Short mmCIF file of C-alpha atoms in Angstrom, two decimals:
data_model
loop_
_atom_site.label_atom_id
_atom_site.label_comp_id
_atom_site.label_asym_id
_atom_site.label_seq_id
_atom_site.Cartn_x
_atom_site.Cartn_y
_atom_site.Cartn_z
CA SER A 1 -2.30 -9.05 -32.23
CA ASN A 2 -1.01 -6.39 -34.75
CA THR A 3 1.04 -3.54 -33.15
CA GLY A 4 -1.30 -1.15 -31.27
CA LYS A 5 -1.98 2.42 -32.48
CA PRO A 6 -2.30 4.97 -29.63
CA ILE A 7 -5.51 7.12 -29.83
CA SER A 8 -5.08 10.93 -30.32
CA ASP A 9 -8.66 12.31 -29.95
CA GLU A 10 -8.39 13.21 -26.19
CA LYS A 11 -11.86 11.58 -25.63
CA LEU A 12 -12.50 8.97 -22.88
CA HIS A 13 -12.22 5.34 -24.18
CA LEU A 14 -12.35 2.72 -21.35
CA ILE A 15 -11.35 -0.99 -21.50
CA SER A 16 -11.54 -3.54 -18.65
CA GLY A 17 -10.25 -7.01 -17.93
CA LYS A 18 -9.32 -9.70 -15.38
CA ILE A 19 -5.80 -11.14 -14.63
CA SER A 20 -6.68 -14.72 -13.48
CA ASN A 21 -4.46 -16.68 -11.03
CA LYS A 22 -1.22 -14.57 -10.98
CA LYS A 23 1.01 -12.91 -8.29
CA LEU A 24 0.27 -9.18 -7.70
CA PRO A 25 2.60 -7.05 -9.91
CA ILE A 26 4.93 -6.41 -6.86
CA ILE A 27 8.79 -6.48 -7.09
CA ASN A 28 10.44 -8.43 -4.20
CA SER A 29 13.61 -6.26 -3.92
CA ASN A 30 15.65 -5.22 -0.83
CA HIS A 31 14.56 -2.14 1.22
CA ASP A 32 15.79 -0.36 4.35
CA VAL A 33 12.64 0.03 6.58
CA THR A 34 12.46 1.84 9.96
CA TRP A 35 9.92 0.93 12.71
CA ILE A 36 8.91 2.29 16.20
CA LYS A 37 7.11 -0.17 18.50
CA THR A 38 6.32 -1.08 22.18
CA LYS A 39 7.87 -4.00 24.11
CA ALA A 40 6.09 -7.36 24.66
CA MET A 41 3.66 -6.89 27.60
CA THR A 42 2.19 -9.95 29.46
CA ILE A 43 -0.83 -11.92 28.12
CA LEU A 44 -3.92 -10.92 30.16
CA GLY A 45 -7.40 -12.58 30.37
CA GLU A 46 -10.88 -10.84 30.51
CA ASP A 47 -10.45 -10.17 34.32
CA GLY A 48 -7.33 -8.06 33.35
CA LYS A 49 -4.86 -10.65 34.85
CA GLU A 50 -2.14 -13.03 33.53
CA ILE A 51 -3.09 -16.29 31.78
CA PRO A 52 -0.82 -18.65 33.80
CA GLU A 53 -0.19 -20.70 30.57
CA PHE A 54 1.10 -17.60 28.61
CA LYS A 55 3.55 -16.49 31.40
CA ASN A 56 6.73 -15.22 29.60
CA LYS A 57 5.67 -17.74 26.86
CA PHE A 58 4.79 -14.85 24.45
CA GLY A 59 3.60 -11.21 24.82
CA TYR A 60 1.89 -8.63 22.57
CA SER A 61 2.86 -5.16 21.15
CA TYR A 62 1.77 -2.34 18.74
CA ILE A 63 3.98 -1.25 15.76
CA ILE A 64 4.21 1.41 13.01
CA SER A 65 6.10 0.04 9.94
CA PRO A 66 7.43 1.36 7.70
CA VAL A 67 8.12 4.76 9.38
CA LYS A 68 10.78 5.33 6.61
CA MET A 69 11.52 3.19 3.49
CA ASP A 70 14.87 3.58 1.62
CA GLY A 71 15.45 6.75 3.72
CA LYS A 72 12.24 8.65 2.77
CA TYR A 73 9.03 8.81 4.92
CA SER A 74 6.72 6.23 3.25
CA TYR A 75 3.15 6.63 1.82
CA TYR A 76 2.73 2.90 2.81
CA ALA A 77 3.17 3.61 6.59
CA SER A 78 0.81 1.26 8.57
CA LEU A 79 -0.09 0.04 12.16
CA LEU A 80 -0.31 -3.64 13.40
CA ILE A 81 -0.64 -5.88 16.56
CA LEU A 82 2.21 -8.43 17.05
CA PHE A 83 2.22 -11.52 19.35
CA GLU A 84 5.98 -12.23 20.06
CA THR A 85 7.33 -15.61 21.37
CA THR A 86 10.25 -16.15 23.88
CA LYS A 87 12.99 -18.91 23.99
CA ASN A 88 10.81 -21.57 25.82
CA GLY A 89 7.59 -20.13 24.24
CA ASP A 90 8.33 -20.23 20.47
CA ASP A 91 8.50 -24.08 20.14
CA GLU A 92 5.12 -24.35 22.02
CA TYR A 93 2.78 -21.49 20.85
CA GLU A 94 1.67 -20.36 17.33
CA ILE A 95 -0.77 -17.34 17.30
CA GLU A 96 -3.31 -17.84 14.41
CA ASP A 97 -5.86 -14.98 14.86
CA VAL A 98 -7.01 -11.94 16.94
CA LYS A 99 -10.70 -10.78 16.72
CA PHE A 100 -11.99 -7.67 18.64
CA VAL A 101 -15.08 -8.36 20.92
CA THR A 102 -15.73 -4.81 22.41
CA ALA A 103 -15.65 -2.57 19.25
CA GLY A 104 -14.59 -3.29 15.59
CA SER A 105 -15.58 -7.04 15.91
CA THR A 106 -16.54 -6.82 12.17
CA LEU A 107 -12.80 -6.22 11.31
CA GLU A 108 -10.74 -8.93 9.52
CA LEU A 109 -7.35 -8.58 11.28
CA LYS A 110 -5.77 -11.84 9.91
CA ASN A 111 -3.95 -10.37 6.88
CA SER A 112 -3.24 -12.71 3.90
CA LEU A 113 -0.48 -10.41 2.47
CA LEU A 114 1.50 -10.30 5.81
CA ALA A 115 4.36 -12.81 6.42
CA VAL A 116 5.18 -14.30 9.89
CA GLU A 117 7.97 -11.93 11.11
CA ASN A 118 11.11 -12.58 13.24
CA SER A 119 10.82 -10.60 16.52
CA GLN A 120 13.05 -7.51 16.40
CA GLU A 121 12.97 -7.21 20.29
CA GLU A 122 15.92 -8.74 22.26
CA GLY A 123 15.18 -12.28 23.68
CA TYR A 124 12.03 -12.80 21.47
CA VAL A 125 11.94 -15.38 18.57
CA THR A 126 8.80 -15.13 16.27
CA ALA A 127 6.36 -12.16 15.81
CA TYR A 128 2.83 -13.13 14.56
CA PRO A 129 1.43 -9.86 13.06
CA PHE A 130 -2.28 -8.75 12.55
CA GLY A 131 -3.95 -5.53 11.21
CA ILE A 132 -4.89 -3.52 8.08
CA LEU A 133 -2.26 -1.76 5.84
CA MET A 134 -2.42 2.04 5.02
CA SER A 135 -5.78 2.07 6.99
CA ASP A 136 -7.05 4.40 9.83
CA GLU A 137 -9.39 1.65 11.15
CA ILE A 138 -7.81 -0.06 14.23
CA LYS A 139 -7.29 3.21 16.26
CA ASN A 140 -11.13 3.79 16.13
CA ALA A 141 -12.14 0.32 17.55
CA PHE A 142 -9.76 0.97 20.54
CA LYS A 143 -10.98 4.63 21.15
CA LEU A 144 -14.42 3.25 22.23
CA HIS A 145 -12.28 7.02 29.91
CA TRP A 146 -10.07 4.16 28.42
CA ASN A 147 -10.73 0.54 29.57
CA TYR A 148 -9.49 -2.95 28.54
CA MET A 149 -10.40 -3.95 24.94
CA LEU A 150 -11.78 -7.52 24.92
CA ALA A 151 -10.76 -9.83 22.02
CA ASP A 152 -10.61 -13.57 21.11
CA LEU A 153 -7.06 -14.84 20.38
CA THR A 154 -6.73 -18.14 18.45
CA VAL A 155 -3.53 -19.89 19.69
CA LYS A 156 -2.20 -23.27 18.36
CA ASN A 157 -0.07 -25.68 20.44
CA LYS A 158 2.76 -27.35 18.39
CA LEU A 159 3.27 -30.09 21.08
CA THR A 160 -0.50 -31.10 21.27
CA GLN A 161 -1.63 -30.04 17.71
CA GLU A 162 -4.74 -28.53 19.49
CA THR A 163 -5.84 -24.94 18.50
CA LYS A 164 -7.73 -23.23 21.41
CA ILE A 165 -9.55 -19.80 21.73
CA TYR A 166 -8.63 -17.59 24.77
CA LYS A 167 -10.57 -14.60 26.21
CA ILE A 168 -7.91 -11.80 26.49
CA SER A 169 -7.89 -7.98 27.17
CA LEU A 170 -5.64 -5.54 25.20
CA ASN A 171 -4.80 -2.14 26.88
CA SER A 172 -6.41 0.75 24.83
CA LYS A 173 -4.72 3.96 26.16
CA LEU A 174 -1.20 3.11 24.87
CA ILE A 175 -2.23 2.98 21.16
CA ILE A 176 -3.71 6.53 20.90
CA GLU A 177 -0.68 7.63 23.01
CA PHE A 178 1.78 5.74 20.70
CA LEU A 179 0.13 7.44 17.62
CA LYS A 180 0.61 11.03 19.02
CA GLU A 181 4.32 10.46 20.07
CA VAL A 182 5.18 8.91 16.65
CA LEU A 183 3.40 11.97 15.03
CA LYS A 184 5.28 14.30 17.50
CA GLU A 185 8.58 12.91 16.07
CA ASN A 186 7.45 12.39 12.42
CA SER A 187 4.98 15.12 11.31
CA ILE A 188 5.16 14.50 7.50
CA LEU A 189 3.08 11.32 8.30
CA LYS A 190 -0.06 13.49 9.02
CA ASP A 191 -0.04 14.36 5.23
CA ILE A 192 2.08 11.53 3.57
CA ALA A 193 0.19 8.72 5.48
CA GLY A 194 -3.64 8.52 5.70
CA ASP A 195 -5.86 9.67 8.62
CA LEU A 196 -3.84 7.09 10.65
CA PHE A 197 -2.29 10.32 12.17
CA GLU A 198 -5.36 12.72 11.82
CA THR B 1 15.83 -10.39 28.31
CA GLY B 2 12.89 -12.56 27.11
CA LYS B 3 10.36 -11.44 29.76
CA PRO B 4 7.24 -9.33 28.88
CA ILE B 5 6.53 -5.95 30.64
CA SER B 6 3.70 -7.06 33.06
CA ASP B 7 3.50 -3.44 34.40
CA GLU B 8 1.17 -1.71 31.83
CA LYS B 9 3.40 1.46 31.44
CA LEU B 10 4.60 2.75 27.98
CA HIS B 11 8.02 1.32 26.82
CA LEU B 12 8.87 2.11 23.10
CA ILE B 13 11.84 0.31 21.31
CA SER B 14 13.03 1.22 17.73
CA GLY B 15 15.17 -0.21 14.89
CA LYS B 16 16.32 -0.13 11.25
CA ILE B 17 15.99 -3.27 9.02
CA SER B 18 18.89 -2.90 6.49
CA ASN B 19 18.75 -4.44 2.99
CA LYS B 20 16.06 -7.14 3.52
CA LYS B 21 12.76 -8.19 1.79
CA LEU B 22 9.41 -6.79 3.04
CA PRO B 23 7.57 -9.40 5.19
CA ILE B 24 4.93 -9.88 2.42
CA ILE B 25 3.22 -13.05 1.10
CA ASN B 26 2.51 -12.70 -2.66
CA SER B 27 0.64 -15.84 -3.86
CA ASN B 28 -1.76 -16.06 -6.88
CA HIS B 29 -4.88 -13.78 -7.02
CA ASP B 30 -7.65 -12.67 -9.44
CA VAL B 31 -7.41 -8.91 -10.24
CA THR B 32 -9.91 -6.65 -12.13
CA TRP B 33 -8.71 -3.42 -13.86
CA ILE B 34 -10.16 -0.55 -15.90
CA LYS B 35 -7.95 1.91 -17.87
CA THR B 36 -8.01 4.26 -20.86
CA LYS B 37 -6.87 2.83 -24.20
CA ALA B 38 -3.24 3.97 -24.62
CA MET B 39 -3.02 7.59 -25.92
CA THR B 40 -0.58 9.43 -28.19
CA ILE B 41 2.49 10.97 -26.43
CA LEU B 42 2.38 14.78 -26.71
CA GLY B 43 5.23 17.30 -26.44
CA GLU B 44 5.30 20.60 -24.50
CA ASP B 45 3.23 22.19 -27.40
CA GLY B 46 0.39 19.60 -27.07
CA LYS B 47 1.32 17.85 -30.41
CA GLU B 48 2.50 14.26 -31.07
CA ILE B 49 6.24 13.57 -30.56
CA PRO B 50 7.01 12.10 -34.04
CA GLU B 51 9.67 9.70 -32.62
CA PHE B 52 7.09 7.90 -30.35
CA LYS B 53 4.28 7.72 -33.00
CA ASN B 54 3.02 4.06 -32.80
CA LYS B 55 6.06 3.22 -30.52
CA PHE B 56 4.30 3.70 -27.14
CA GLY B 57 1.32 5.54 -25.60
CA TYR B 58 0.11 6.49 -22.12
CA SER B 59 -3.00 5.49 -20.17
CA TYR B 60 -4.75 6.00 -16.74
CA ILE B 61 -5.65 2.77 -14.77
CA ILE B 62 -7.51 1.88 -11.50
CA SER B 63 -6.14 -1.47 -10.16
CA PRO B 64 -6.98 -3.66 -8.38
CA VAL B 65 -10.77 -2.90 -8.72
CA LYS B 66 -11.61 -6.44 -7.45
CA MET B 67 -9.05 -8.82 -5.88
CA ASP B 68 -10.17 -12.53 -5.70
CA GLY B 69 -13.70 -11.47 -6.75
CA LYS B 70 -14.27 -8.75 -4.07
CA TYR B 71 -14.11 -4.92 -4.36
CA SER B 72 -10.67 -4.00 -2.91
CA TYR B 73 -9.44 -1.10 -0.73
CA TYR B 74 -6.07 -1.37 -2.57
CA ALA B 75 -7.70 0.29 -5.63
CA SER B 76 -5.07 2.76 -6.88
CA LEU B 77 -4.80 5.38 -9.73
CA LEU B 78 -1.62 4.72 -11.84
CA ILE B 79 -0.23 6.19 -15.06
CA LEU B 80 1.08 3.48 -17.47
CA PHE B 81 3.37 3.93 -20.47
CA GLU B 82 2.62 0.95 -22.76
CA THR B 83 4.86 -0.09 -25.71
CA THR B 84 3.39 -1.27 -29.07
CA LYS B 85 4.65 -4.52 -30.70
CA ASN B 86 6.64 -2.27 -33.15
CA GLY B 87 8.02 0.03 -30.35
CA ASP B 88 8.80 -2.49 -27.54
CA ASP B 89 12.33 -3.65 -28.62
CA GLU B 90 13.61 -0.02 -28.78
CA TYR B 91 11.84 1.86 -25.90
CA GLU B 92 11.80 1.30 -22.09
CA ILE B 93 10.16 4.06 -19.93
CA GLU B 94 12.24 4.65 -16.76
CA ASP B 95 10.57 7.57 -14.91
CA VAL B 96 8.03 10.43 -15.05
CA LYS B 97 8.12 13.69 -13.02
CA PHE B 98 5.30 16.26 -12.97
CA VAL B 99 6.48 19.83 -13.68
CA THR B 100 3.23 21.96 -13.69
CA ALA B 101 2.03 20.70 -10.25
CA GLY B 102 2.99 17.87 -7.81
CA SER B 103 6.70 18.22 -8.88
CA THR B 104 7.86 16.82 -5.46
CA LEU B 105 5.87 13.50 -5.85
CA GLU B 106 8.14 10.41 -6.44
CA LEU B 107 6.14 8.50 -9.12
CA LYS B 108 8.83 5.79 -9.70
CA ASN B 109 7.39 3.26 -7.20
CA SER B 110 9.98 0.72 -5.83
CA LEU B 111 7.09 -1.77 -5.09
CA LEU B 112 5.61 -1.87 -8.68
CA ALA B 113 6.98 -4.51 -11.13
CA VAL B 114 7.10 -3.93 -14.93
CA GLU B 115 3.81 -5.48 -16.22
CA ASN B 116 2.69 -7.10 -19.51
CA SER B 117 0.18 -4.70 -21.21
CA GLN B 118 -3.48 -5.95 -21.01
CA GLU B 119 -4.34 -4.02 -24.25
CA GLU B 120 -4.27 -5.78 -27.68
CA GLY B 121 -1.17 -4.75 -29.69
CA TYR B 122 0.77 -3.51 -26.61
CA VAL B 123 3.59 -5.50 -24.91
CA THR B 124 5.12 -3.78 -21.82
CA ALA B 125 3.35 -1.45 -19.33
CA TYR B 126 5.67 0.75 -17.19
CA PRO B 127 3.58 1.79 -14.13
CA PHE B 128 4.00 5.05 -12.11
CA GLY B 129 2.14 6.58 -9.12
CA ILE B 130 1.31 6.12 -5.43
CA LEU B 131 -0.83 3.23 -4.07
CA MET B 132 -4.03 4.17 -2.13
CA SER B 133 -3.32 7.95 -2.59
CA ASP B 134 -5.29 10.96 -3.92
CA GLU B 135 -1.94 12.68 -4.75
CA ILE B 136 -1.82 12.18 -8.58
CA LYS B 137 -5.49 13.38 -8.77
CA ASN B 138 -4.71 16.44 -6.52
CA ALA B 139 -1.66 17.25 -8.71
CA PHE B 140 -3.84 17.19 -11.91
CA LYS B 141 -6.65 19.20 -10.24
CA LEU B 142 -4.06 22.01 -9.69
CA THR B 143 -3.89 22.42 -13.53
CA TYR B 144 -7.54 23.74 -13.69
CA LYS B 145 -7.36 27.61 -13.63
CA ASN B 146 -9.69 30.46 -14.86
CA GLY B 147 -12.50 27.95 -15.68
CA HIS B 148 -10.13 25.85 -17.94
CA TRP B 149 -8.06 22.60 -17.99
CA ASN B 150 -4.36 22.97 -18.96
CA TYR B 151 -2.00 20.07 -19.72
CA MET B 152 0.16 18.59 -16.98
CA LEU B 153 3.70 19.27 -18.34
CA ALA B 154 5.97 16.38 -17.20
CA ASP B 155 9.55 15.11 -17.78
CA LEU B 156 9.55 11.56 -19.24
CA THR B 157 12.77 9.49 -18.86
CA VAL B 158 13.01 7.09 -21.86
CA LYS B 159 15.83 4.58 -22.50
CA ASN B 160 16.60 3.68 -26.12
CA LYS B 161 17.64 -0.05 -25.70
CA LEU B 162 19.05 -0.13 -29.33
CA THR B 163 21.42 2.85 -28.72
CA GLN B 164 21.68 2.20 -24.90
CA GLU B 165 21.23 6.02 -24.30
CA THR B 166 18.66 7.49 -21.85
CA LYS B 167 17.02 10.93 -22.42
CA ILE B 168 14.34 13.15 -20.80
CA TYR B 169 11.43 14.43 -22.95
CA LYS B 170 9.00 17.25 -22.02
CA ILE B 171 5.48 15.78 -22.40
CA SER B 172 1.88 16.96 -21.86
CA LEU B 173 -0.51 14.58 -19.98
CA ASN B 174 -4.29 15.36 -20.44
CA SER B 175 -5.67 16.55 -17.01
CA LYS B 176 -9.38 16.79 -18.08
CA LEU B 177 -9.32 13.03 -19.02
CA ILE B 178 -8.12 11.83 -15.53
CA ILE B 179 -11.21 13.60 -14.01
CA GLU B 180 -13.59 12.17 -16.71
CA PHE B 181 -11.90 8.76 -16.14
CA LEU B 182 -12.45 8.88 -12.33
CA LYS B 183 -16.11 10.00 -12.96
CA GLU B 184 -16.85 6.96 -15.27
CA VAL B 185 -15.06 4.44 -12.99
CA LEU B 186 -17.15 5.58 -9.95
CA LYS B 187 -20.46 5.68 -11.95
CA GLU B 188 -19.89 1.98 -12.78
CA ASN B 189 -18.42 1.10 -9.33
CA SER B 190 -20.04 3.51 -6.72
CA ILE B 191 -18.66 1.30 -3.88
CA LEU B 192 -15.15 2.66 -4.77
CA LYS B 193 -16.38 5.89 -3.01
CA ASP B 194 -16.50 3.84 0.27
CA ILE B 195 -13.29 1.67 0.21
CA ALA B 196 -10.73 3.48 -2.09
CA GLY B 197 -9.87 6.09 0.61
CA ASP B 198 -9.83 9.78 -0.59
CA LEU B 199 -9.32 9.07 -4.31
CA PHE B 200 -13.09 9.43 -4.93
CA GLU B 201 -14.11 11.78 -1.99
CA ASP B 202 -14.27 14.61 -4.59
CA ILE B 203 -15.56 12.18 -7.34
#
C-alpha cells in the first residue's frame, strides 16, 4: 500500500505471515567448497559380509562438507553418508534411502534439499547422499565397544525397474574416529560448527 | 581404481570443488515468519538519521518458523533492512558489521537472496546474519553491562543508486528488543526451544 513509516518507540511490535508455494530465499551462486571424506568401502549384509550383487557395483563413505566455503571455515559445515557407484555399477543401481535399524531409526536421512552428487573419488560415477545438515544427530545413533550398525538400504535397479530393500551393516568406529581427526586438523569447527565436533 | 576398500581400515581422501553450485535442490515450499515491524534507523547518538527517515527501517526476524506446515530446525535469527515505497529507488543496503561486540562475525551471508518485504508499505528486505546460529544473540547479550542494555553500535554500508556512491554509516541497533523478541517468539512457539539449536537455550 502507501509507503511504510518505520516505528521509533523502541517497543516490541510483532507481525507474522506465510510465503505460499515459493523457492527458499537462497541465491544459487558459485562457491569454492572443501571436503574431507573416506573411500568407498564394500557393501556388507547383516552377517558383516559382502552382498555378492553389490560387489564393486557401488560402495559407501562418510563426508564432512563444507569444511571451508569461499576460503573461510563455514558455519554450515555438515556430515553425510554417500553411496558411490562404479563404471559397471552406475547404469544398474540407484540408491533411494538409508534407514538406521540399531539406534536412531526415528531419523529421516533422505534429505529433500540435497541434490544427487557426482562422486569426487577416482573411478566412481554417482554419489547418492543422505543425512541432516548443521546437525549433531548422526554421530549419536552410531555411538550406541563398537559393533556393526544395522540399517535398511532402499536400492532401485534401472535394468529391471524393481526397487528392493537390503539388510546391510555400516561400520561405527570410523565415524567417531573421522570426527576427531577432522577436528584435530580444523579446530575452529568446535566453535564455528555445532556440537557436531563437541 | 573403481574398487571399494573391502578391508575395514581408515582411508581418508580430500578435495576442493572450485567455482561450482552447491548440490542443493530448491523447489517450492510454504514458509512461516515472525518479525518486528521495521524500526527507525538510529545514529551513534541513538537519534534518527534524518536522511533515512521514511526511506528504510530495520527489523528482527525468525524464519523459517514452519516449512511446508511443520516446525523447522532451520529457524534462524536475521536482521533485515527494509526499504519503504518512497525510499526503495534510492537506497540498497549492502552490509552491516557489529562494532560494540561480535565485530568478527561476517553478517553478509553469500547464501541469502535479496527478498521482497512481507510488511505493508515496504518493498525490498536486505537480510543479514548466520543460519542456525546463536551468534547474533550472543553478540547482543555482550552489550548488557552494570544491570543495563546499551545499543549495539554497527557500521551500515548503504549504496545510493541515484548517485551510484556507497557510504558507511554508524548506527545503533536496539539490543533489549532482540531479547524481548526472542522471549515472545518462544512463548508462542515453545517447540523452538527443542529444534532451533542453541538460539533459545538461554530463552
